[PDB]
Assembly symmetry: C2
Homo-oligomer: 220 residues x 2
């Protein structure tokens, strides 16, 4: 498995764009790698279709997208046409699909589905998402089972928080949406906030501590 | 780390309700274990205050909530008064908070935060969520950093999916909300579908395979 802040593997893999080396492919960029159990399956088709719908939203954020399953590349290409059909968007695939036929990555990234296997007993991946920063380090992840399609707007929501909190000295509260007030991190001193967050609110709390601090979301 | 389908560690831990043994405390119930980096911090107070708002949503779904950080129980009890205040809900804490002071669970669960450490250099948990079925097996997990407060509506949404797809041979599509049409799982034959999903719809796709099968939510 991979824990937060680990450098993500500079793996080599075949895909729908040919063989790639992960750190080469990603470059100096945010990236999202996500997996699905099996090509030509229904939930997986709605998900890769949804990602097509949202591809300008990822592009606006400088976020490279890459899909993965344990199927071969020829199946990725043929299935891709079904994915396009269901997205309702016409055009080439806006992202590659890795073929993890050896289960190398499935195992290394701790993303084997607990329930879905080939008829032959081969593991398959679950619906994993890994958010990787331009530093190549793992920033956030989710492991959802095959039974449960993902919420891709939550992925974009958290890409928004992660890009903001990367540059500014805030953290985003429960249920935060882009443009909403943020929390000032406990590290910022009163004296430095005077200048940095001149309209900060300190909400009194029964403990008498001064940590419950809100500020408008900084421009970034 | 822990992976999907592993039986969740039957740990013994101190908490706001005293020392507990995890499988015993859970019993035959669904469970959500969730962690935050540090008590007396802003986002964490928002998040725990939000879970109090939603305690009844979880209760009606048979889901036991339990929170965790590396702080001590005394800090838990005192910080819990602020959490209650931010929640706006009056009354005793609706869930226990485990105290992982030795970092044993933070390490076992693969949930150490990549940036937050104590002043003294001790690791701290990130904002992790583990959903545990009645069989004690891990069914879903999320690892969010300290910077990035959670979405507890999504936790609810995915619990509704896990609970549905445990009982019926469907799976929930991208962005599904309760009440939305589900997909029939590929392992269901047309023969079985005639009986099990009388209103099933097969949507034509360029490959001509008939796997794209929608049904009303069972």
């Amino acid at each position: 498995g991979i824990t937060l802040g680990e450098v993500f593997p500079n793996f080599e893999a075949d895909s729908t764009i040919g063989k790639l080396k992960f750190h080469d492919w990603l470059g100096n960029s945010w990236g999202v790698l996500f997996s699905h159990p099996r090509d030509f399956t229904p939930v997986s088709t709605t998900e890769l279709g949804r990602v097509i719908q949202l591809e300008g939203d990822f592009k606006k954020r400088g976020v490279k997208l890459i899909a993965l399953s344990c199927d071969n590349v020829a199946d990725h290409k043929e299935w891709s046409e079904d994915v396009k059909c269901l997205s309702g968007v016409k055009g080439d695939m806006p992202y590659p699909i890795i073929a993890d036929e050896t289960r190398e990555l499935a195992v290394k990234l701790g993303m084997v589905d607990p329930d879905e296997r080939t008829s032959t007993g081969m593991p398959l991946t679950c619906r994993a998402v890994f958010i990787i920063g331009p530093d190549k380090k793992l920033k956030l992840s989710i492991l959802y089972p095959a039974t449960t399609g993902r919420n891709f707007s939550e992925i974009l929501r958290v890409i928004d928080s992660l890009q903001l909190t990367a540059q500014k000295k805030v953290a985003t509260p429960a249920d935060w949406q882009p443009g909403d007030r943020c929390m000032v991190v406990p590290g910022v001193s009163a004296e430095e906030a005077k200048t940095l967050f001149p309209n900060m609110e300190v909400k009194a709390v029964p403990s008498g501590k001064g940590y419950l601090r809100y500020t408008p979301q900084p421009k970034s």
